[PDB]
Every structure is written in structure tokens, then in C-alpha cells.
Amino acid sequence: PSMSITRLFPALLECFGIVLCGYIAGRANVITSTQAKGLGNFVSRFALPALLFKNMVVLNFSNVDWSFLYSILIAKASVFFIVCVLTLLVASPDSRFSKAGLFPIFATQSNDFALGYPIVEALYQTTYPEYLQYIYLVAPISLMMLNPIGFIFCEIQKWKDTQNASQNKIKIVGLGLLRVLQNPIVFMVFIGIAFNFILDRKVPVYVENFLDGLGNSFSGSALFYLGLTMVGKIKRLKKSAFVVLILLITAKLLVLPLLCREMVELLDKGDSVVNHTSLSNYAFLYGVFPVAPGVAIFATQFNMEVEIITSGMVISTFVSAPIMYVSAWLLTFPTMDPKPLAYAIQNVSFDISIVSLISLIWSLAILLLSKKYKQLPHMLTTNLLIAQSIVCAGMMIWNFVKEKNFVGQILVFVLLYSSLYSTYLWTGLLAISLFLLKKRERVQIPVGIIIISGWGIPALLVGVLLITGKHNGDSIDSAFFYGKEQMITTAVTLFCSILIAGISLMCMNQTAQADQQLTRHVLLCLLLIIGLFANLSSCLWWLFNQEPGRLYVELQFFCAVFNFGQGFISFGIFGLD
Numbered sequence: 001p002s003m004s005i006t007r008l009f010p011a012l013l014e015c016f017g018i019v020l021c022g023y024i025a026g027r028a029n030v031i032t033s034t035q036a037k038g039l040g041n042f043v044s045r046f047a048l049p050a051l052l053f054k055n056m057v058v059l060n061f062s063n064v065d066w067s068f069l070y071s072i073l074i075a076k077a078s079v080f081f082i083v084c085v086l087t088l089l090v091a092s093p094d095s096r097f098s099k100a101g102l103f104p105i106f107a108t109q110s111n112d113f114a115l116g117y118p119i120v121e122a123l124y125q126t127t128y129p130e131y132l133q134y135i136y137l138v139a140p141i142s143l144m145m146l147n148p149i150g151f152i153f154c155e156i157q158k159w160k161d162t163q164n165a166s167q168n169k170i171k172i173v174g175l176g177l178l179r180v181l182q183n184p185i186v187f188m189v190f191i192g193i194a195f196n197f198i199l200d201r202k203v204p205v206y207v208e209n210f211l212d213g214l215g216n217s218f219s220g221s222a223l224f225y226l227g228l229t230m231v232g233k234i235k236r237l238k239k240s241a242f243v244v245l246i247l248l249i250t251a252k253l254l255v256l257p258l259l260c261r262e263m264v265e266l267l268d269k270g271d272s273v274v275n276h277t278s279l280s281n282y283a284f285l286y287g288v289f290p291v292a293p294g295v296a297i298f299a300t301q302f303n304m305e306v307e308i309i310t311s312g313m314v315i316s317t318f319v320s321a322p323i324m325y326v327s328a329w330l331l332t333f334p335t336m337d338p339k340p341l342a343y344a345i346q347n348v349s350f351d352i353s354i355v356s357l358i359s360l361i362w363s364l365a366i367l368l369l370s371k372k373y374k375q376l377p378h379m380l381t382t383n384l385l386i387a388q389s390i391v392c393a394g395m396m397i398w399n400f401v402k403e404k405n406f407v408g409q410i411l412v413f414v415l416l417y418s419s420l421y422s423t424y425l426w427t428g429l430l431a432i433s434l435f436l437l438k439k440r441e442r443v444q445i446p447v448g449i450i451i452i453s454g455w456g457i458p459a460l461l462v463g464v465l466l467i468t469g470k471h472n473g474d475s476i477d478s479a480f481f482y483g484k485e486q487m488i489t490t491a492v493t494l495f496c497s498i499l500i501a502g503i504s505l506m507c508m509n510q511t512a513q514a515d516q517q518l519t520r521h522v523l524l525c526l527l528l529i530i531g532l533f534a535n536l537s538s539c540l541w542w543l544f545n546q547e548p549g550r551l552y553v554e555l556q557f558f559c560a561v562f563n564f565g566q567g568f569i570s571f572g573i574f575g576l577d
């Protein structure tokens with residue numbers, strides 16, 4: 001491909017595995033606060049400056065694509081102006097300046113060095129090595145463009161809160177600009193651009209090896225210190241702050257990458273559509289990088305609004321992993337032929353299945369060791385988690401077995417799609433069971449029957465498939481393995497589970513119009529009903545329409561996201577306690 005996207009899942013799991021290890025080590029008291037502050041000083045005083053010094057001396061400025069820099073800088077300036085004006089017009093009259101200073105920095109400035117760079121290295125080190133340069137151009141230039149406007153607003157808050165409230169605007173501007181110049185990023189970028197010419201882009205060998213030893217450690221060490229600083233740092237936001245934060249994380253991770261893509265499309269006019277499309281897709285990938293930890297440091301230095309900013313940096317860090325994996329593959333699909341595209345969706349399914357199965361094994365282990373799996377509504381959720389685990393496991397086994405014996409393919413198909421149908425039906429059965437719990441006049445729910453229904457009716461539907469369908473031993477995507485009958489059966493399973501679920505939740509509400517965790521159960525059901533409607537749409541599109549008009553590709557991708565990553569929904573609702 002134009003982009004070595006198979007290395008994205010290992011890259012994401014390396015980066016976020018390091019952040020998760022840092023978070024675990026931080027909780028587990030493996031590391032003292034003196035060690036944590038030593039690590040912060042290593043990361044910020046030596047390693048980041050060394051990485052910047054290295055890359056800035058190396059960089060051949062006369063054959064950078066300045067077009068991409070202008071694009072991302074105009075896009076970040078656009079999201080800056082937008083978020084800044086929106087904040088100053090929306091927020092409360094006194095404290096609006098801290099918000100209007102820090103929020104657009106939050107919405108534009110990203111973690112480009114710690115995890116953007118290993119990700120762009122993974123995606124583009126072979127296919128476009130010049131794209132690794134642009135992190136070191138974009139992130140600093142955007143810092144010294146946009147962070148002084150935001151800092152100047154924050155300093156206006158500091159000056160207005162400071163009861164003297166009348167001093168020089170020049171001093172406000174100067175102190176804001178000074179924090180930008182004192183930042184090791186822009187500091188070292190100026191210094192390294194000077195050394196660029198003083199050495200004519202050649203680091204002396206001894207300096208080169210010293211800078212390599214330090215700079216290469218920045219990626220891993222920065223992500224580990226990020227893990228340490230995440231300890232407890234998502235302190236429970238007020239719901240109004242959560243609303244503000246949803247908008248800001250949407251800004252950084254959806255509006256900015258969309259805007260970057262549009263800007264590159266407007267401003268690049270290079271020679272070929274392939275290089276243009278690759279640069280456009282790189283612009284989107286750039287937008288998706290999470291908020292820079294430096295933004296939390298700025299909020300702490302101003303002593304202002306640490307709660308929203310730290311919580312949002314941490315949440316944005318984690319939310320960028322799904323959106324990056326999703327967005328990168330989604331942007332790749334329009335270039336692929338139908339057969340490579342089937343391999344692409346099975347690759348997506350396999351990756352999401354690994355991380356979903358880990359989340360499900362954790363969630364299962366919680367429900368089992370909690371022994372809450374005995375309770376009447378949670379016994380059924382446990383069976384759903386087992387069905388989701390067998391989905392993800394059957395997908396993992398299937399990704400290998402689709403090459404191996406026809407005997408093995410049929411067995412693994414039976415396991416995989418019977419359990420997939422079982423998760424489908426368990427959505428509806430969990431809804432009808434929480435309706436039975438709400439219809440509290442009733443006897444104890446027939447657990448044996450509801451279990452035999454959720455497991456056995458899908459076994460009957462797949463036995464039906466083996467007997468009534470015909471086998472596509474070529475076909476890569478398991479969802480077409482038994483041809484038309486496969487999708488007919490899938491559609492009927494989805495249609496039944498959606499009818500059951502929707503009628504159950506409607507009737508639950510109509511009963512209300514007169515720990516069981518009925519709210520969390522209905523949340524699990526509702527999010528799964530979104531997924532079931534998506535899968536029903538895929539089935540009914542492929543059935544009633546002969547042609548997969550291109551939305552069918554994006555929808556089959558989201559079907560795979562849901563089918564194999566629904567373990568994330570069940571983990572988010574139960575695995576986090």
C-alpha cells in the first residue's frame with residue numbers, strides 16, 4: 001500500500017502498552033515520586049531536546065514540503081480561532097479567559113513526539129520518509145504560532161484576577177510569549193535550526209551517537225512518564241465539564257483532522273493523485289494525535305483549570321487509539337481492490353479481536369471473581385461476555401484457519417458465527433430479561449431457558465446454515481462463507497434480536513411510565529442495538545442490493561468494528577469497576 005498500515009496495530013499497541021505499563025507501575029507503587037520527577041526531568045530536559053536537536057540539524061529545509069506545513073498550520077490556526085472565539089462567546093464572563101487560553105491550545109496542540117512520531121514512523125518510514133520530518137516542523141511552529149495567543153489569554157486571566165488589573169498589555173503579551181520561548185520544544189528548535197547552518201546539516205559523529213542514545217529513548221520514556229502522570233488524574237468531572245470536554249475532544253480528534261485533510265486538499269497542488277492522497281491522508285492522521293501533555297503542564301503552571309485539561313489530556317490519549325486505528329484503515333480502503341479489501345477487513349477484525357478479547361477476559365474475570373455472575377440480570381451478561389469472547393477467539397482462530405483445511409474452516413466458522421449470532425440474540429435476551437426484572441410482579445426469570453435460547457437458537461441457525469447453504473471455500477470474509485444463506489440467516493438473527501430488544505426496551509420504558517444495575521444493562525443493550533442496526537444494514541444492503549456502493553465498504557468496516565469490538569462496550573460498562 002501507500003502506507004504500511006499493517007504496522008499500525010503493533011505500533012499502537014507498543015505505544016499504548018507502554019502508557020498502560022506506566023499507569024500500572026504508577027498505581028502499583030513500583031516507582032517513587034522522586035523517581036517520577038527524575039523521569040520527568042530526563043524526558044523533558046534531555047531526551048526531548050536531544051530528539052529535536054538531532055532532527056533539526058539533520059533536516060534538509062530546501063526540500064521540505066512547505067505546502068503540508070502551511071496546511072496543518074492553517075488548520076490548527078482555524079481550530080484555534082474557532083475554539084477561541086466559541087469559548088469567549090460561550091463561557092462565564094469572569095473565568096472565560098483561562099478557558100479561552102487553554103482550551104484552543106488543548107484543541108490544537110498534540111502529543112506529536114511521544115506517540116505521533118512512533119506511529120508515523122510505523123506507517124511511513126518505508127513508504128514516505130519525508131513525512132517523519134513534518135512532525136518536527138509542525139508541532140514546534142504550531143506551538144510558537146498558537147500557544148502564545150492562548151498563553152496571552154491565560155495571562156489576561158491572571159492579570160484580571162490579580163487585583164491590580166491595570167498593568168501594561170505589553171507585559172501581558174511578553175510574559176505569554178516568554179513561556180513559549182522557554183518551552184524546550186521551541187527553545188531547542190531555534191537552537192537546532194541555527195546548528196543546521198553552522199554544521200551544514202552534518203552532526204559530528206560523536207555528537208550523533210550521543211544524541212541518538214538520548215533522543216531515541218524519548219519515545220518510550222515519554223510514554224512511560226505519561227503513564228505515571230495519569231495516576232488518578234482523571235478526577236471525576238462535573239457533568240457540565242464533561243460536556244465541554246466531549247466538544248473539545250471532538251475538536252482535537254475529529255474537527256482538526258477533517259479540517260487538516262480539507263486544508264491539504266485545498267493547498268496542495270502537486271503532480272500526482274497518489275502523492276496528493278497520501279499527503280491528504282497523512283494530514284488526517286496528524287489531526288488525530290492526542291492532546292500534548294505539555295498542555296496539562298501549562299494549566300498547572302497557570303494554576304488554572306487543571307481538572308478539565310488533565311482529565312481531557314488523559315481521556316484524549318486513550319480515545320486517540322480507537323480513532324487512529326479506525327481512521328487510518330478507513331482512509332486506506334478507497335484505494336484497495338475488492339480482494340485486497342476483504343483481506344483488509346479481516347486484518348481489522350483480527351486486531352480488534354485481540355484487544356477486545358483481552359478486555360473481555362478482564363471483564364469476565366471481574367464478573368466471575370466478583371461472583372456477581374450469579375445475580376439474575378448479570379448471569380445473562382456473563383453469558384453474553386462468553387459469547388463475545390468466543391466471537392473474538394473464533395475470529396483470531398479464523399484468520400489463520402481460512403488458509404488451512406476445509407474441515408477446520410467449517411468447524412471454526414460454526415464456532416465463530418454461532419457465537420456471533422449468540423451475541424446478537426443475547427442483546428435481545430438481555431433486554432427481555434431486564435424487562436422481566438422491571439415487570440417485577442413476575443417469578444424468577446427462566447434462566448435455564450434464556451441461556452438455552454441465547455446459545456441453542458444460534459446453534460440451530462448455524463446448523464440450518466450448514467444444511468441449507470452452500471460453501472464458498474474461496475471466500476476471505478467469514479460473513480459470506482455460506483453465501484446468500486449466510487447473510488439471510490444473519491439478517492434474520494439480527495432482525496429477531498432487534499425486534500426483541502426494541503420491543504423489550506420500549507416495554508421497559510412503558511412500565512416505568514406507571515444490584516440489578518438496570519441503567520448499565522440498558523446502556524449495554526442500547527449501544528449493542530446501535531451495532532445490531534449497523535449489521536442489519538450491512539446484511540440488508542448486500543441482500544436487497546446487488547452492488548456494494550462505496551458506503552457498503554465503510555459500513556462493512558464498522559460492522560467488523562462492532563462485531564469484534566463489542567467486548568469494549570461490555571468492558572466499558574462492567575470491566576472498569
Ligand SMILES: O=C(O)Cc1c[nH]c2ccccc12
Pocket residue numbers: 043044048110111112113114222223225226292293294295
Ligand atoms: O507534550 C508534548 O507534546 C511532549 C511532551 C513533553 N513532555 C512530555 C512528557 C510525557 C509525554 C510527552 C511529553
